[PDB]
Design an enzyme around this catalytic site. Structure first.
Site, PDB file in Angstrom:
ATOM      1  N   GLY A  76       0.660  -0.935  -0.108  1.00 17.19           N
ATOM      2  CA  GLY A  76      -0.121   0.053  -0.023  1.00 17.19           C
ATOM      3  C   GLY A  76       0.690   1.364   0.003  1.00 17.19           C
ATOM      4  N   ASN A  79       0.590   6.885  -1.749  1.00 17.81           N
ATOM      5  CA  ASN A  79       0.333   6.883  -3.278  1.00 17.81           C
ATOM      6  C   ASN A  79      -0.499   5.657  -3.850  1.00 17.81           C
ATOM      7  OD1 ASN A  79       1.724   9.379  -3.349  1.00 17.81           O
ATOM      8  ND2 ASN A  79       3.564   8.658  -4.157  1.00 17.81           N
ATOM      9  N   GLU A 119      -4.111   3.191   3.170  1.00 17.24           N
ATOM     10  CA  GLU A 119      -4.371   4.621   3.532  1.00 17.24           C
ATOM     11  C   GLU A 119      -5.594   5.205   2.784  1.00 17.24           C
ATOM     12  OE1 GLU A 119      -0.533   6.669   3.784  1.00 17.24           O
ATOM     13  OE2 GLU A 119       0.419   5.105   4.477  1.00 17.24           O
ATOM     14  N   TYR A 120      -6.572   5.136   3.124  1.00 14.73           N
ATOM     15  CA  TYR A 120      -7.131   4.420   4.239  1.00 14.73           C
ATOM     16  C   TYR A 120      -8.507   3.912   4.110  1.00 14.73           C
ATOM     17  CZ  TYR A 120      -3.675   7.837   6.216  1.00 14.73           C
ATOM     18  OH  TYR A 120      -2.651   8.761   6.655  1.00 14.73           O
ATOM     19  N   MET A 189       1.471   5.627  12.919  1.00 15.27           N
ATOM     20  CA  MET A 189       2.208   6.676  12.151  1.00 15.27           C
ATOM     21  C   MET A 189       1.982   8.137  12.795  1.00 15.27           C
ATOM     22  SD  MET A 189       1.284   5.453   8.074  1.00 15.27           S
ATOM     23  CE  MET A 189      -0.427   5.297   8.321  1.00 15.27           C
ATOM     24  N   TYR A 191       3.053  10.699  12.959  1.00 12.14           N
ATOM     25  CA  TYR A 191       3.627  12.043  12.094  1.00 12.14           C
ATOM     26  C   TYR A 191       2.657  12.386  11.013  1.00 12.14           C
ATOM     27  CZ  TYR A 191       5.238   7.524   9.880  1.00 12.14           C
ATOM     28  OH  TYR A 191       5.086   6.402   9.482  1.00 12.14           O
ATOM     29  N   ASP A 192       3.228  13.490   9.970  1.00 12.24           N
ATOM     30  CA  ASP A 192       2.522  13.942   9.293  1.00 12.24           C
ATOM     31  C   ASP A 192       1.213  14.571   9.969  1.00 12.24           C
ATOM     32  OD1 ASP A 192       3.984  13.193   7.044  1.00 12.24           O
ATOM     33  OD2 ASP A 192       2.846  11.341   6.742  1.00 12.24           O
ATOM     34  N   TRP A 337      10.166   5.833   9.961  1.00 15.89           N
ATOM     35  CA  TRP A 337       9.963   6.264   8.618  1.00 15.89           C
ATOM     36  C   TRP A 337      11.101   7.362   8.661  1.00 15.89           C
ATOM     37  CZ3 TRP A 337       7.186   3.730   4.776  1.00 15.89           C
ATOM     38  CH2 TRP A 337       7.255   4.699   3.489  1.00 15.89           C
TER      39      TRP A 337
HETATM   40  C1  LIG Z   1       4.621   8.243   4.685  1.00 13.53           C
HETATM   41  C2  LIG Z   1       4.766   9.678   4.510  1.00 13.53           C
HETATM   42  N1  LIG Z   1       3.774  10.678   4.215  1.00 13.53           N
HETATM   43  C3  LIG Z   1       3.062  10.829   2.755  1.00 13.53           C
HETATM   44  O1  LIG Z   1       3.641  10.045   1.918  1.00 13.53           O
HETATM   45  C4  LIG Z   1       2.049  11.698   2.616  1.00 13.53           C
HETATM   46  C5  LIG Z   1       1.220  12.117   3.812  1.00 13.53           C
HETATM   47  C6  LIG Z   1       0.100  13.197   3.717  1.00 13.53           C
HETATM   48  C7  LIG Z   1      -0.874  13.057   4.885  1.00 13.53           C
HETATM   49  O2  LIG Z   1      -0.428  12.516   5.927  1.00 13.53           O
HETATM   50  N2  LIG Z   1      -1.856  14.303   4.645  1.00 13.53           N
HETATM   51  C8  LIG Z   1      -2.463  14.218   5.779  1.00 13.53           C
HETATM   52  C9  LIG Z   1      -3.665  15.249   5.570  1.00 13.53           C
HETATM   53  C10 LIG Z   1      -3.798  15.982   4.484  1.00 13.53           C
HETATM   54  C11 LIG Z   1      -2.870  15.630   3.592  1.00 13.53           C
HETATM   55  C12 LIG Z   1      -1.972  14.670   3.450  1.00 13.53           C
HETATM   56  N3  LIG Z   1      -1.072  14.420   2.441  1.00 13.53           N
HETATM   57  C13 LIG Z   1      -0.244  13.580   2.553  1.00 13.53           C
HETATM   58  N4  LIG Z   1       0.686  13.527   1.309  1.00 13.53           N
HETATM   59  C14 LIG Z   1       0.688  13.997   0.281  1.00 13.53           C
HETATM   60  C15 LIG Z   1       0.978  15.564   0.390  1.00 13.53           C
HETATM   61  C16 LIG Z   1       0.123  16.701  -0.052  1.00 13.53           C
HETATM   62  C17 LIG Z   1       0.579  17.989  -0.040  1.00 13.53           C
HETATM   63  C18 LIG Z   1       2.077  18.148   0.693  1.00 13.53           C
HETATM   64  C19 LIG Z   1       2.768  17.041   1.126  1.00 13.53           C
HETATM   65  C20 LIG Z   1       2.277  15.801   1.168  1.00 13.53           C
HETATM   66  C21 LIG Z   1       1.886  12.550   1.648  1.00 13.53           C
HETATM   67  N5  LIG Z   1       2.546  12.375   0.361  1.00 13.53           N
HETATM   68  C22 LIG Z   1       6.155  10.225   3.719  1.00 13.53           C
HETATM   69  C23 LIG Z   1       6.656   9.533   2.794  1.00 13.53           C
HETATM   70  C24 LIG Z   1       7.686   9.792   1.953  1.00 13.53           C
HETATM   71  C25 LIG Z   1       8.625  10.655   2.629  1.00 13.53           C
HETATM   72  C26 LIG Z   1       8.280  11.380   3.664  1.00 13.53           C
HETATM   73  C27 LIG Z   1       7.067  11.145   4.568  1.00 13.53           C
END
Ligand SMILES: C[C@H](NC(=O)c1cc2c(=O)[n+]3ccccc3[nH]c2[n+](Cc2ccccc2)c1N)c1ccccc1
Length: 370
Positions: A76, A79, A119-120, A189, A191-192, A337
Site C-alpha cells: 500500500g 500514493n 491509506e485508508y 504513524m 507523524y504527518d 520512517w
Molecule cells: C509516509 C509519509 N507521508 C506521505 O507520503 C504523505 C502523507 C500525507 C498526509 O498524512 N496528509 C494528511 C492530511 C492531509 C494531506 C496529507 N497529504 C499527505 N501526502 C501528500 C502531500 C500533499 C501535500 C503536501 C505534502 C504531501 C503525503 N505524500 C512520507 C512518505 C515519504 C517521505 C516522507 C514522508
C-alpha cells in the site's frame, strides 16, 4: 522492545551520497525491517519496482548475518490509493484470492510477515463499508497465517498494520479493539500531523499540544494519538510508536513571521536530494547553511528556518524525549520512517551513520546481537 524500520524501494534512485542501496542496510540496527512497498494486481500481491526480486534477496539475506532479524513486506502506502483495496475486500472470493497469494508470495521470497498500509479504509475515496471490511480482511489474514503455520509446521507469518494518528481517519476506518486482537503489532504513524496542506506552519510530529491550541487541533500530537489508540483498545505491548527521520516544509508568506502558526503560502522548496516539495530528509536540515534552529517549548521538538523556508523536524534530542515517553507508557517499541531519510551514510550531519536510528536503538537499550 521492538525497533521497526522501514526500507523504501525508491530510495535507490536518489542522486549522489543520498542513494540508498543494499550495502547501506545494517542487519543489527533494528529488530524488524519492513519493505515498502508491494502492490496489487488482479487482487494478488505483486512487486512495484523492476528490481524488487533482486532487492528481496538482499533484504532477506540480512537474516544470514543476524538470524534473529524479522522481515516484513508492506502493501500500500499513500500514493497507492484505495481503489484496489476497496475492490479486493468487496467480496469473500476476492479476499481469499488476496490472502492465498500473500502467503505464497511471502514464503517464496522469504519474508516473515505482512504489513498492511492501506491509506485508508473509509477515507481517501474509500467508502464507509470498508471499515468493517478492513476488520474482516485483518481477521482473514490472521486466521490464514495461523492455519498455514499448522499445516506447514513453519513459524507463523506475522501480521502488522500501519495506522493513522488523526481521529477523523481512525473513526472512519478502524475498529481498533477488534483489529488489535488479530494484529501482532500496530505501527502508529505518529507523524504527518501538520504539513503544507494547511495554510499555517505546524510541526510534522509534535509530542504534546501547544497551549494556544483548541478543538480538534489539540489532539494532533504524539501523546494524544498514543492515548487514542490505547483507550480505543490497543494493548500497550502491541502499540509501536512511529518516529520520523524527515521534516515537513513550508514556504512562509513573509520571512518576517517565522512562528509556529505563521501564515504559509505552500510547500517548502524541494530538497536537493529528495526532490519532493513539502518534505525534507534529516540530512537536508541538519547542516543547512545559514538557517536558524529553534525549539517549540510546549511540543518538545525543533524547527528551522532560512529566508521564507520553514521546516519542522526531529533531532537526536526529540527522539530521546519520545523514547523516554514511550517507555513511561509501556509501549511495545518504536517504528521509524525511514532508513533512507536518516543520515544513513554519515555524510551530512557529522554525527556518524544513522544518528537518529542509533539514538532509538540506544535509548531502547536493545540487545547487541552479533
Ligand atoms: C509516509 C509519509 N507521508 C506521505 O507520503 C504523505 C502523507 C500525507 C498526509 O498524512 N496528509 C494528511 C492530511 C492531509 C494531506 C496529507 N497529504 C499527505 N501526502 C501528500 C502531500 C500533499 C501535500 C503536501 C505534502 C504531501 C503525503 N505524500 C512520507 C512518505 C515519504 C517521505 C516522507 C514522508
Amino acid at each position: 522492545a521492538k525497533l521497526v524500520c522501514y526500507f523504501t524501494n525508491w530510495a535507490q534512485y536518489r542522486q549522489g551520497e543520498a542513494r540508498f542501496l543494499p550495502k547501506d542496510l545494517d542487519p543489527s540496527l533494528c529488530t524488524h525491517l519492513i519493505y515498502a512497498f508491494a502492490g496489487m494486481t488482479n487482487h494478488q500481491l505483486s512487486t512495484t519496482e523492476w528490481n524488487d526480486e533482486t532487492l528481496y534477496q538482499e533484504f532477506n539475506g540480512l537474516k544470514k548475518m543476524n538470524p534473529k532479524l524479522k522481515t516484513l513486506l508492506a502493501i500500500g502506502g499513500w500514493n497507492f490509493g484505495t481503489q484496489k483495496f476497496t475492490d479486493m475486500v468487496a467480496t469473500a472470493n476476492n479476499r481469499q484470492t488476496f490472502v492465498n497469494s500473500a502467503i505464497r508470495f511471502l514464503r517464496k521470497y522469504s519474508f516473515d510477515g505482512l504489513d498492511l498500509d492501506w491509506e485508508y479504509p473509509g477515507s481517501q475515496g474509500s467508502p464507509a463499508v470498508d471499515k468493517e471490511r478492513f476488520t474482516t480482511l485483518v481477521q482473514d489474514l490472521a486466521n490464514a497465517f495461523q492455519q498455514e503455520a499448522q499445516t506447514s509446521g513453519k513459524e507463523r507469518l506475522l501480521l502488522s498494520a500501519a495506522v493513522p494518528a488523526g481521529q477523523t481517519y481512525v473513526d472512519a476506518g478502524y475498529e481498533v479493539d477488534k483489529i488489535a486482537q488479530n494484529l501482532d503489532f500496530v505501527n502508529l504513524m505518529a507523524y504527518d500531523f501538520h504539513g503544507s496542506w494547511e495554510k499555517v506552519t505546524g510541526h510534522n510530529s509534535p509530542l504534546y499540544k501547544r497551549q494556544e491550541e483548541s478543538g480538534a487541533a489539540a489532539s494532533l500530537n504524539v501523546d494524544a494519538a498514543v492515548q487514542q489508540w490505547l483507550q480505543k483498545g490497543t494493548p500497550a505491548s502491541k502499540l509501536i510508536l512511529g518516529m520520523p527521520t524527515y521534516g515537513r516544509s513550508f514556504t512562509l508568506a513573509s520571512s518576517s513571521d517565522t512562528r509556529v502558526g505563521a501564515p504559509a503560502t505552500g510547500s517548502g522548496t524541494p530538497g536537493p536530494f529528495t526532490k519532493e516539495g513539502g518534505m525534507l530528509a534529516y540530512y537536508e536540515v541538519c547542516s543547512w547553511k545559514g538557517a536558524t534552529k529553534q525549539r517549540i517549548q510546549d511540543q518538545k521538538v525543533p524547527y528551522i528556518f532560512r529566508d521564507n523556508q520553514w521546516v519542522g523536524f526531529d533531532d537526536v534530542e526529540s527522539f530521546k524525549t519520545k523514547v523516554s515517553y514511550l517507555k513511561q507508557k509501556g509501549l511495545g517499541g518504536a517504528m521509524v520512517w525511514a532508513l533512507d531519510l536518516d543520515d544513513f551514510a554519515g555524510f551530512s550531519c557529522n554525527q556518524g551513520r544513522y544518528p537518529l536510528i542509533q539514538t532509538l536503538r540506544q535509548e531502547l537499550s536493545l540487545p547487541y546481537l552479533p
